[PDB]
Amino acid sequence: MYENLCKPIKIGNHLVKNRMKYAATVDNFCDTKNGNVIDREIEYLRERAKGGFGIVVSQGGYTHILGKGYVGQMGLVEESHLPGLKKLADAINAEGAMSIGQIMHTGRYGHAHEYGIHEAIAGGKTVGPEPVGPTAMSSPIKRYSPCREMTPEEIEEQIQAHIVAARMFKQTGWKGVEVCAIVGYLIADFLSRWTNKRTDKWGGSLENRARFLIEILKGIRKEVGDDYPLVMRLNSTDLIEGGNTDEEYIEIAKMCEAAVRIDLFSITVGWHESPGAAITAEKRPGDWLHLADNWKKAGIKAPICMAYRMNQPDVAEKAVAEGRIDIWEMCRPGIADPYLPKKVCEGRPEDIVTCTACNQGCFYYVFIDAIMGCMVNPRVGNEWDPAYAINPAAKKKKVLVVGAGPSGMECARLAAVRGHDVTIMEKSDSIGGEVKLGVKSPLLYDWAETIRYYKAQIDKLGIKLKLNTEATADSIKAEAPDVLVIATGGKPSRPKIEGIDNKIVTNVFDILEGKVKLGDKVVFIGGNEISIQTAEYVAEQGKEVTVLEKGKHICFDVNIFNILQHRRLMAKLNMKSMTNVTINEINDDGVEISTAGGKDVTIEADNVVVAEGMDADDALAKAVGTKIAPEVYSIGDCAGVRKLYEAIHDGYKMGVKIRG
Ligand SMILES: CC(C)(COP(=O)(O)OP(=O)(O)OC[C@H]1O[C@@H](n2cnc3c(N)ncnc32)[C@H](O)[C@@H]1OP(=O)(O)O)[C@@H](O)C(=O)NCCC(=O)NCCSC(=O)c1ccc2ccccc2c1
Ligand SMILES: Cc1cc2nc3c(=O)[nH]c(=O)nc-3n(C[C@H](O)[C@H](O)[C@H](O)COP(=O)(O)OP(=O)(O)OC[C@H]3O[C@@H](n4cnc5c(N)ncnc54)[C@H](O)[C@@H]3O)c2cc1C
Ligand SMILES: Cc1cc2nc3c(=O)[nH]c(=O)nc-3n(C[C@H](O)[C@H](O)[C@H](O)COP(=O)(O)O)c2cc1C
Ligand code: SF4
């Protein structure tokens, strides 16, 4: 099947079994106190190695405390980090994967002070905990604090720290070393004309701006030797107004190959300060491949690998075939499904847990100093915890799952994988629950890949799927199961709003279910995630939409990465919104509201959508007590409304606990 993706390839002197690479992923799994590698991180990458990835890269390791940009970033500074580095390398090498250590000083994005650093040594002198860069300056956004200009001594020092960091990797069994010179970290800071305002040998012309990177490459090449694999990550476009152009990054790449032999180029897209889209669902697989074509036609000697929304094996396969790239790199797809490679080379892509790009468990959690997690993969960060082990339990109990939503299908999938006699009751004609409806939203198209997954596991696990069957207090008893899993989900709320009983009112479910004939002027009462996403679907059809939020901001329950995603879309669709508005009435023509200080104002509309919240659809659960079956359980939104992430987690936490 996926012949090209499974082809071998030599990276330097080391042969790689396939063309699938798991990219560096800082996940705060390391000890936040000192940057040492711990079991959580060891078992995390071990599973990615077991999964079949021909290459597994560690997270970006910080070469200096001032370069720590994540509360739990791996450290590459002192000898106290060697035991963990050797253990992690062996875990990856044992699985037949090429282990590669990444060296990453965050530079301008450092948060040493936020992590409790009062003072540090740099260039033989005491300094403050502020981040460092080639030029002292402030960030346009508040996340990154003002940086300090690096003395020429600190620059020479960091060249050595990279050399030493490469040594720590090689001497601990790592099969290769990767230099991280992307998205806005220290090296990228010197390469960019926007952040590098220096006039000495380290700044000015494109040659001087790239001197820092070249000296890091030359220094490491001498340290590791001509045989050791040396690769790097370099932007192909930084998406920064005033930064470097696409052809400049190509020229920089040429300079790197002229200085040392580059074994592999990982070309990236954008900076954390870029106002454009680089990794959100807005971008589809294959959109950035045109940048790879530029590097290939320009004569780049080393092979190239790319990622950034390349969550489709089909697209990657065609890419490797056409020579656009030489390796299919990926980070989020490797998080969502550690066994994606094994599933690809075994001709079973239908079993892939695809990445939806929710950016909640991975990007968002890591930037808020939290343990990384995954929406579709509840094992991320728990690969070490025996509580998530999947045990057989030869008893084989009879399990009845009520609700084919995400939580219900995750509970049944595992219970079936463990040998239980699972059955699912669905009152509708299709599985998916609210995911079946959200997939209609423009930015959630990936949710179709999720439906496919569960639809394929049910068909492969021989699970009893009873579609068009509304579970009642009688059918359950008739089925007489050993364990009852109630996953009815949630339903739209209906607050006490004068006139809410008017015909002009409708809820989210009816909209996405086509059980309503809307018009051209629509108004949504509620600025939460679900409400906004529903409006996007309404506007996509060519209709005027307005969102009314009583709170201070819209998209209040949206992660910081997706906030920028809705703005670009709500604006592209010409959508209006209002905050701090009081809902006073809903009549035939629309909804009457009031701002701060009276200011009564009507909103003429053809359809008013009450989408302020969701209610737990716990009707059935409360009708059948905990005595109807030897073991009764409620999971998902019916046991308390949460989001999709907490639903799949509840399902898997339930599928592995069904002992009897
Ligand atoms: C999520 C942010 C990183 C910042 O978060 P935050 O909202 O908390 O920043 P801040 O609070 O300081 O910003 C305040 C205001 O500016 C807005 N803002 C923040 N970042 C913005 C931005 N980039 N453009 C426009 N507005 C922005 C933000 O919406 C907010 O609006 P307001 O308070 O309501 O008035 C944001 O900049 C952002 O979404 N960046 C996009 C990330 C991105 O695409 N990076 C390039 C591709 S990712 C990549 O290749 C990569 C490589 C290596 C990595 C290693 C470690 C971890 C991840 C890595 C990713
Ligand atoms: C439009 C929309 C967009 C959303 N976007 C996001 C998002 O971006 N991020 C996020 O985290 N969350 C999002 N959510 C929320 C997320 O979809 C839910 O949290 C999640 O689907 C809850 O899963 P569940 O299995 O607990 O319930 P559900 O998904 O609602 O599953 C319930 C299923 O059980 C069936 N059922 C109910 N009662 C019975 C019965 N008596 N007998 C048989 N079958 C029954 C229902 O028909 C349904 O198929 C969105 C929701 C909507 C509606
Ligand atoms: C949580 C998280 C941590 C990341 N850590 C690193 C890192 O340490 N070094 C690096 O070069 N890229 C890092 N990245 C960027 C990814 O390696 C990858 O290039 C990017 O997320 C887009 O690729 P993808 O679409 O396959 O996810 C990280 C991304 C995420 C979401
Ligand atoms: S949390 Fe979302 S974006 Fe991150 S890996 Fe999982 S599915 Fe992909």
Author numbering: 13 to 672
Q: Which sentences from the paper describe this structure?
A:
During anaerobic degradation of the PAH model compound naphthalene, 2-naphthoyl-CoA reductase (NCR) reduces 2-naphthoyl-CoA (NCoA) to 5,6-dihydro-2-naphthoyl-CoA (DHNCoA). It belongs to a distinct subclass of the old yellow enzyme (OYE) family of flavoproteins that are composed of three domains binding FMN (flavin mononucleotide), a [4Fe–4S] cluster and either ADP or flavin adenine dinucleotide (FAD). The architecture of NCR clearly reveals a spatial separation between electron uptake at the FAD near the surface and substrate reduction at the deeply buried active site FMN cofactor. The two flavins are electronically connected via a [4Fe–4S] cluster with edge to edge distances of 6 Å to FMN and 9 Å to FAD, respectively.
The NCoA structure in complex with the substrate NCoA and the product DHNCoA were determined at 2.2 and 2.4 Å resolutions, respectively. No significant conformational changes were found between the two binary NCR complex structures and between them and the substrate-/product-free NCR as documented in rms deviations of 0.45 and 0.49 Å, respectively. Reduction of NCR by excess of the two-electron donor DHNCoA (exergonic reverse reaction) was incomplete, and the neutral flavin SQ remained close to maximum intensity. Together with results obtained in titrations with dithionite, this finding indicates that FMN readily accepts a hydride from DHNCoA, and the FMNH− formed reduces the FAD and the [4Fe–4S]2+ cluster by single electrons, each.
